[PDB]
Amino acid sequence: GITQSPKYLFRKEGQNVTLSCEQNLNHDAMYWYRQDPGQGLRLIYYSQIVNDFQKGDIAEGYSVSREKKESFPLTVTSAQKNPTAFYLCAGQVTNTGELFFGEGSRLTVLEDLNKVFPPEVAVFEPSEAEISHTQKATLVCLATGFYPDHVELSWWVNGKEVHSGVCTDPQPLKEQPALNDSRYALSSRLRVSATFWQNPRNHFRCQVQFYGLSENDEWTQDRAKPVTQIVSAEAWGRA
Amino acid sequence: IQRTPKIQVYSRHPAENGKSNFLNCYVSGFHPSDIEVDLLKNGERIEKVEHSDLSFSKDWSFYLLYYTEFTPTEKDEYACRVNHVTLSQPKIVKWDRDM
Amino acid sequence: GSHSMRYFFTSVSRPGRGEPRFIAVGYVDDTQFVRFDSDAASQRMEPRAPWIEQEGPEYWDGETRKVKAHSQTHRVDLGTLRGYYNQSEAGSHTVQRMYGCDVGSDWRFLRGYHQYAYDGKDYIALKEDLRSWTAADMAAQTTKHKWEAAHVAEQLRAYLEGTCVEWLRRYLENGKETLQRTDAPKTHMTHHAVSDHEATLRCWALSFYPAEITLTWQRDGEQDTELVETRPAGDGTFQKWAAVVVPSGQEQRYTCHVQHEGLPKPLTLRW
Amino acid sequence: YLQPRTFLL
Amino acid sequence: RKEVEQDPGPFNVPEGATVAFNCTYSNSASQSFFWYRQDCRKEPKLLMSVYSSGNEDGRFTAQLNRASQYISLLIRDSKLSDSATYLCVVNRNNDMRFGAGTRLTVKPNIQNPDPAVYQLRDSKSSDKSVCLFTDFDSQTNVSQSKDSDVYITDKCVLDMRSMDFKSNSAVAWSNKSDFACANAFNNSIIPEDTFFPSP
């Protein structure tokens, strides 16, 4: 049950950044791995005991400090080899060897602060053709034109989150794949019985949490600053 | 638990007068590991006495070996001065050519 | 013959501020070859034998990172046993850890050891079956069931039955001249008469390796005999003597029986 | 060869 | 080789089939072995520990051969819950080293295929419309669009455990209003009986 913060992260090139990792299960050691597509997990730093820390296979360009047993912050310095990358924190039980990871922190670098956009969420209602042909109703949600790819999508039926009958895309979709700083798109689907959708009493909402700018970042542009926000669209039943 | 040390004063080879030999004091079976051992050539300690690394046997009891180069004679008297946390006074075990 | 590699550890806690002393020593058939002391300026794994000396830079780095990792484990083991026995930090306690390998004349695995001790008394020990533990007191019962759930002995079995015997066989070959030797006890006898009516016969055994010998006094083939622990001479060989006080004139009755690995025939000594 | 794995009490 | 090498993969097997994983570690002195499961853009989660005995944990069985230095994971009656990448984790000293991983993707056996492309309209507006390719058989692979202004997704497997019904899906939309197309998924090998309702 170790907790890493923040779950999604973005920092400019040349700006240092520290991601925290605390543990409440009283683990023995703490580890810092990282994941890049095409290769496995590579060790960065690890500490067996408090006030100690040992280097890893790619420790050059990173710095840690284990001044307390319940904290092991990793500082991603100006080591430029960090574009979009998955930085993972683990906690080991030396008697068992088991590694317990946090939910992971995704770090992406942006050259221009004017390249961050919030997602445009819209809930598309099922068609009558599908209702008559399959006796089922599918609601497709679309969050489009957002960078970085730091979004979390969920469905809410009558004020309650659902998991069954939902197929959100695993990876976001690049609108213009030619670029590295390309805006992404994510589609989800929620399928329910026809008789459920034919009821006006039911409220369907697609919630999209966006991880973007904060108050530490200045904004001098015309459009609204893309802060960390929740964009959601909703729809009711139809007969 | 505190175990009193077992002291042995002897020589490497059968002690022959005038023959270059070694004087060994082998202390074993003591706990804790804090022990002070001295070799008394005619009642006084020797300034240069090397010793082995500290280790213990299977029963967790430590043992050491203190040795010095010496030429045994009849007039010379040798002993081993050992002190420990279980010894009220330092124990001086005189050397015997037959033991 | 029958050889062995053992690793002995000693961690004595220092009251208050100050790093506790960590001691690590390795023995290949009762022959020290490596050492480490946390109070030495080298801060590395030091060799105490020629055979291990020419092992390259990669060996010493890996062994030093592991003796430093065994140290970080013993730092936590000191404070953990403090809470198990409900002790204060102002005290000084000694932790002793030993694990090794045993191997016979067949050069196959036979027994594996992995045992702990706290303040000179037994704590936890690995049984001969290598899949069950032994708890001495109540505090040891806490770690007995903590290691049963984590299957520590199967992870230790991969070492005792795997890597450890392989390196033991390697260490024996690199030091064949000083490892597999079987020197024979240069036995003799001395006669010291304390008075004109009794005398102390004494049966010596000198310059023998290994330390496995048996000195027994028997009168005409038939226990108040003074026996001392097998002591080292320093030159790599050991000593041992057994003496019995006999009345003058009956020295022909007593005989000494010396048995050793190097001796093809069990010796019987007579005055 | 020190065992690569260290076990806590 | 490497310190932990597994199968390149990926593994695409039908539901209920048995999948076998393999892993070879170079360090003969390793003693702690584990199989880890990791979903897409998620953290690795411990599946089971590996011991020389060979522990069976329900549908998952892991075996270890220290001699050949090889680790095998066996998953029987594979469900859609098993679709993830399975990492082989072997110890260095006390630190665990992760293999490159092998991916397992479980395809559901569509009992009654019903391929069709329905047009869905927005709740708030009608000039923004999306095409939905759903209920097709698993043999169909939806290919990405060869056009800049149309955005097409990959096959998504939806599970309605309330009805014991599982369905594939693929969504496609475009920015300009002139995309009401049944030609959206034209670049795919769409079935013959695919139903195309009128706009």
CSV table of C-alpha atoms in Angstrom, one decimal, chain B residues 1-82:
chain,number,residue,atom,x,y,z
B,1,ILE,CA,25.2,-15.6,29.6
B,2,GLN,CA,28.9,-15.2,30.4
B,3,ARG,CA,31.4,-18.0,30.0
B,4,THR,CA,34.8,-18.0,31.6
B,5,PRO,CA,37.7,-18.3,29.2
B,6,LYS,CA,39.8,-21.4,28.8
B,7,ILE,CA,43.5,-20.6,28.7
B,8,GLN,CA,46.4,-22.7,27.4
B,9,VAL,CA,50.1,-21.8,27.5
B,10,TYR,CA,52.3,-23.9,25.3
B,11,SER,CA,54.8,-23.8,22.4
B,12,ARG,CA,54.7,-24.5,18.7
B,13,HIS,CA,57.6,-27.1,18.8
B,14,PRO,CA,58.9,-29.1,21.8
B,15,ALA,CA,60.7,-26.5,23.8
B,16,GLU,CA,64.5,-27.0,23.4
B,17,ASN,CA,66.9,-24.5,25.0
B,18,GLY,CA,68.5,-22.1,22.6
B,19,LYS,CA,66.2,-23.2,19.7
B,20,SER,CA,64.1,-20.6,17.9
B,21,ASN,CA,60.5,-21.4,18.9
B,22,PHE,CA,57.1,-19.8,19.4
B,23,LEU,CA,55.2,-19.1,22.6
B,24,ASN,CA,51.4,-19.5,22.1
B,25,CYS,CA,48.6,-18.6,24.4
B,26,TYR,CA,45.3,-20.0,23.2
B,27,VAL,CA,42.2,-18.6,24.9
B,28,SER,CA,38.9,-20.2,24.0
B,29,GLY,CA,35.3,-20.7,25.2
B,30,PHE,CA,34.6,-17.2,26.5
B,31,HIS,CA,31.7,-14.8,26.1
B,32,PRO,CA,31.4,-11.9,25.5
B,33,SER,CA,34.1,-11.1,22.9
B,34,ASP,CA,35.9,-8.5,25.0
B,35,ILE,CA,39.1,-10.0,26.3
B,36,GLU,CA,42.5,-8.7,27.2
B,37,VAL,CA,45.5,-11.1,26.9
B,38,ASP,CA,49.2,-10.4,27.7
B,39,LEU,CA,52.3,-12.6,27.6
B,40,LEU,CA,54.7,-12.1,30.5
B,41,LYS,CA,58.4,-12.7,29.7
B,42,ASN,CA,59.9,-12.7,33.2
B,43,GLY,CA,56.9,-11.0,34.7
B,44,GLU,CA,56.7,-8.1,32.1
B,45,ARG,CA,54.7,-7.9,28.9
B,46,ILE,CA,56.2,-8.1,25.4
B,47,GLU,CA,55.9,-4.9,23.4
B,48,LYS,CA,55.4,-6.6,20.0
B,49,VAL,CA,52.9,-9.5,20.1
B,50,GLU,CA,50.7,-10.2,17.1
B,51,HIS,CA,47.4,-12.0,17.3
B,52,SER,CA,44.8,-13.7,15.1
B,53,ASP,CA,41.4,-12.5,14.0
B,54,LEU,CA,38.6,-13.0,16.5
B,55,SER,CA,36.3,-16.0,15.7
B,56,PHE,CA,34.0,-18.4,17.5
B,57,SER,CA,33.4,-22.2,17.4
B,58,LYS,CA,30.0,-23.9,16.7
B,59,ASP,CA,28.8,-23.3,20.3
B,60,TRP,CA,29.1,-19.5,19.7
B,61,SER,CA,32.1,-19.3,22.1
B,62,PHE,CA,34.9,-17.1,20.9
B,63,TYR,CA,38.6,-18.1,20.7
B,64,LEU,CA,41.9,-16.2,20.1
B,65,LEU,CA,45.6,-17.0,19.7
B,66,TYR,CA,48.4,-14.8,21.0
B,67,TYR,CA,51.9,-15.7,20.0
B,68,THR,CA,55.4,-14.3,20.1
B,69,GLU,CA,58.9,-15.4,18.9
B,70,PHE,CA,61.2,-16.3,21.7
B,71,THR,CA,64.3,-18.5,22.5
B,72,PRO,CA,63.4,-20.6,25.6
B,73,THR,CA,66.0,-20.9,28.4
B,74,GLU,CA,66.0,-22.3,31.9
B,75,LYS,CA,66.3,-18.9,33.6
B,76,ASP,CA,63.5,-17.3,31.6
B,77,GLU,CA,60.0,-17.7,33.0
B,78,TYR,CA,57.0,-17.2,30.8
B,79,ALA,CA,53.3,-16.9,31.4
B,80,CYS,CA,50.0,-15.6,30.0
B,81,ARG,CA,48.1,-12.7,31.6
B,82,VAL,CA,44.4,-12.9,30.7
